[PDB]
Design a protein around this ligand. Structure first.
Ligand SMILES: NC(=O)c1ccc[n+]([C@@H]2O[C@H](COP(=O)([O-])OP(=O)(O)OC[C@H]3O[C@@H](n4cnc5c(N)ncnc54)[C@H](OP(=O)(O)O)[C@@H]3O)[C@@H](O)[C@H]2O)c1
Ligand SMILES: Cc1oc(CN(C)C(=O)CCc2nc(C3CC3)no2)cc1C(=O)O
Length: 311
């Protein structure tokens, strides 16, 4: 197991547990699998207001504190500001609401979930008469200032962003009077979309890149074309899993660790959850890393359609 030091001095475990499940999955499952993830050795847990599970993820964390398995300081908990709450006066109340649902006094990391802003309101996915998502226009530098106040208040130990491109990161990094840089940029990253350019940019600014859909996404029918390639069926990943006596998923997770990327892995299955912690047990060679680097195909499992159809 291991951690990376963030640019604000805090530490982030390099393997994180992804908690999103689609709305057809009962919320009782998020509670159960987050306990399993902690039992298996995960200490970084990634949630969000969008996921409609912070109450269950927080109950799981509290349960594993109460049974003496971990202390609160051993757990790195992430939440995210949803895009209906970008207007600066909504940022601290959104964080306080997440804290009240999770029954936590602070989050380890609070992220701007997306640079695209949506109409303020109670709906996650506000839509007009024609079924189109209603966007909003917000100066994200003001959103960032409100996030910095949340860190100064102690409600978030660290603050960062998600789904930002280089230009959007530069807008923050170049803001006059910037007090805290983002510690991370959590973005889609896997061998079919390896983000090498953004990764080199983030390294030059001491910003950690955190990979999501590192196992190729849940292929949710709302947004993923069934005809897109299945990452875990890739022949290179399969050959490398055979060389190492591992699985394609483990190859995909270890790839990110060796290139300096913090990696998330969602699983709601006890055996796969426990399997993913084995990413610390083996190593890819430089040749194996070059082969995986050759898989890049600019394939995005997440695009603009992923803002719609959240009930
Ligand atoms: N906008 C954002 O910031 C953003 C976007 C997307 C995701 N995320 C975060 O990143 C997390 C992970 O991304 P993701 O939800 O797209 O899923 P993922 O980590 O790419 O995983 C995809 C699927 O892999 C399967 N899996 C896991 N371990 C496996 C193993 N050892 N062997 C075979 N299959 C395995 C899981 O199925 P089973 O459950 O059946 O095991 C999972 O549904 C999310 O849950 C969320 O926390 C953030
Ligand atoms: C279940 C779920 O859905 C989402 C979708 N969102 C809000 C994103 O920002 C994804 C990336 C994205 N890029 C774009 C540009 C329009 C091309 N549109 O969307 C995140 C999660 C999660 O697990 O966090």
């Amino acid at each position: 197991h291991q951690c990376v030091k963030l640019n604000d001095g805090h530490f982030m475990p390099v393997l994180g547990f992804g908690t999103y499940a689609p709305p057809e999955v009962p919320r009782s499952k998020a509670l159960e699998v987050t306990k399993l993830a902690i039992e298996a050795g995960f200490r970084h847990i990634d949630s969000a207001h969008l996921y409609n599970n912070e109450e269950q993820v927080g109950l799981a964390i509290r349960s594993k504190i109460a049974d003496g398995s971990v202390k609160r300081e051993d757990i790195f908990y992430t939440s995210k500001l949803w895009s209906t709450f970008h207007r600066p006066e909504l940022v601290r109340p959104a964080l306080e609401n997440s804290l009240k649902k999770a029954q936590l006094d602070y989050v380890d990391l609070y992220l701007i979930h997306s640079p695209m802003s949506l109409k303020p309101g109670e709906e996650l996915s506000p839509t007009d008469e024609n079924g189109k998502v209603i966007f909003d226009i917000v100066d994200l530098c003001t959103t960032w200032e409100a996030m910095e106040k949340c860190k100064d208040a102690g409600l978030a130990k660290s603050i960062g962003v998600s789904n930002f491109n280089r230009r959007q990161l530069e807008m923050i990094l170049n803001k006059p009077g910037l007090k805290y840089k983002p510690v991370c940029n959590q973005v889609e990253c896997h061998p079919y979309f390896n983000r090498s350019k953004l990764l080199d940019f983030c390294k030059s600014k001491d910003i950690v890149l955190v990979a999501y859909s590192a196992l190729g996404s849940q292929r949710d029918k709302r947004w993923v074309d069934p005809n897109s390639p299945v990452l875990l069926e890739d022949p290179v990943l399969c050959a490398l899993a055979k060389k190492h006596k591992r699985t394609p998923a483990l190859i995909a997770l270890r790839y990110q660790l060796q290139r300096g990327v913090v990696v998330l892995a969602k699983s709601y299955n006890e055996q796969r959850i426990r399997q993913n912690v084995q990413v610390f047990e083996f190593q890819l060679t430089a040749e194996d890393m070059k082969a995986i680097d050759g898989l890049d195909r600019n394939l995005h499992y997440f695009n603009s359609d992923s803002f719609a159809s959240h009930p």
